[PDB]
Amino acid sequence: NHIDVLINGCGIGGAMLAYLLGRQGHRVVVVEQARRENGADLLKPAGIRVVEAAGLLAEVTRRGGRVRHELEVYHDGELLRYFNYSSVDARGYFILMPCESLRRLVLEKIDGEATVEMLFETRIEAVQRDERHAIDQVRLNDGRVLRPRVVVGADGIASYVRRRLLDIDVERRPYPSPMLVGTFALAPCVAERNRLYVDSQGGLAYFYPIGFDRARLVVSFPREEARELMADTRGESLRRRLQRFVGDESAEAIAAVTGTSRFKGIPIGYLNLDRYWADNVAMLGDAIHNVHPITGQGMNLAIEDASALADALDLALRDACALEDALAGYQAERFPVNQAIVSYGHALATSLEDRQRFAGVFDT
């Protein structure tokens, strides 16, 4: 019952890590509380590099992923910034791909990896540590006992591994504006170009295509206004509010908002843990950092962490270096990258209303 890595959580980060480790022939058990069976949509160049390394890039666009290289940002109805991400660098492009679509693809690949065992509707019950304080035994709620060299927390914003195995508590810092996302019919303007709108009253509306034939609309307003707008389920108050700061180019996208019933809240946190690991326990993704969803980077960073952790763990598992050195390496690589986006998200979210401050944040 000796295994190389026990991964808690089979979200996008956990799945990507399991697949990358499995491809190397490491013995992996993934534990997921939910049945096999909504999240972020964005892959940035660094995330795309991981996907490309995994041999998955072709399948991504085959399954409705969209390559893009432009963004317009409006403030109070007028164009504030236009970004061409590929103007200097041909590989500057980003990809829009639903988290669930990418995860399903990765799970299909894991299905073919003989050294990976995925356990759904399963959870960690108890752990045992050795005299060196490394976890040496883990019992699952099905009665399964495993002896892993490494335990990984890929278990998201409420990480059991963080809270219970590492006994880390995280202060919460709520924001005054929620963010919500709904899915609608795809208007030609949205198929054309991603457009983000914000206003001096704290409104935000971001329209972008998703999959083959749908569009997302991500919105944010101060809490009580957002409540009012969502309460009018036939959508009239929301369309009217949008019309206040969203210009004609997106008129059809506003018209596509036929109701509010299917809007979903998005989690908003602010975190970058000072330690990404302790003993033989490492964490990735939302377990170690929470970025404001205005950045779009929740999935992307989980994928970037997974790749860096796969590299570090591969080295430790091959005995190319001590686990403690490998994990220290993982933190050194990832922490400044994750930190920069956490800071950026908070700066963006808090500067919305102030046009030049907001523009200032974009430039850096």
Helix (H, G, I), strand (E, B), or coil: what is residue 346?
helix
Closest by CA position to 102, among listed 47, 156, 141: 47
CB-nearer residue toward ligand FAD: 25 or 85: 85
- The answer to whether 194 and 208 are in contact (CB under 8 A) is yes
Q: Is 283 exposed, middle or buried (0-12, 13-18, 19+ CB in 10 A)?
A: buried
Binding mask 50-89 for ligand FAD (x = CB under 6 A): ----------------------------------------
Contact between 9 and ligand FAD by CB under 6 A: the answer reads yes
- The answer to whether 208 and 291 are in contact (CB under 8 A) is no
Contact between 99 and ligand FAD by CB under 6 A: the answer reads yes
Question: Exactly one of 110, 296, 326, 330 binds ligand FAD (CB under 6 A); which one?
Answer: 296
CB-nearer residue toward ligand FAD: 286 or 314: 286
Contact between 38 and ligand FAD by CB under 6 A: the answer reads yes
Q: CA 141 to CA 56: how far, in whole Å?
A: 33
- Binding piece for ligand FAD, criterion CB under 6 A, among 11-19, 58-66, 69-77, 107-115: 11-19
- Residues numbered 154 to 183 that lie near ligand FAD (CB under 6 A) are 154-156, 160, 181
Residue located via tokens 């569009």? 215
Closest by CA position to 161, among listed 299, 277, 330: 277
Contact between 304 and ligand FAD by CB under 6 A: the answer reads no
Contact between 266 and ligand FAD by CB under 6 A: the answer reads yes
Q: CA 159 to CA 288: how far, in whole Å?
A: 9
- The answer to whether 5 and 327 are in contact (CB under 8 A) is no
CB-nearer residue toward ligand FAD: 223 or 240: 223
Closest by CA position to 280, among listed 311, 318, 322, 314: 322
- Residues numbered 276 to 295 that lie near ligand FAD (CB under 6 A) are 285-286, 291, 293, 295
- The answer to whether 30 and 284 are in contact (CB under 8 A) is no
Closest approach of ligand FAD to the CB of residue 232, in Å: 21
Hey, what are 75's tokens? Answer: 């403030």
- Residues numbered 200 to 219 that lie near ligand FAD (CB under 6 A) are 218
- The answer to whether 39 and 13 are in contact (CB under 8 A) is no
Contact between 199 and ligand FAD by CB under 6 A: the answer reads no
Closest approach of ligand FAD to the CB of residue 345, in Å: 8
Residue ranges in contact with ligand FAD by CB under 6 A: 8-14, 31-34, 38-40, 99, 123, 154-156, 160, 181, 218, 264, 266-267, 285-286, 291, 293, 295-299, 302
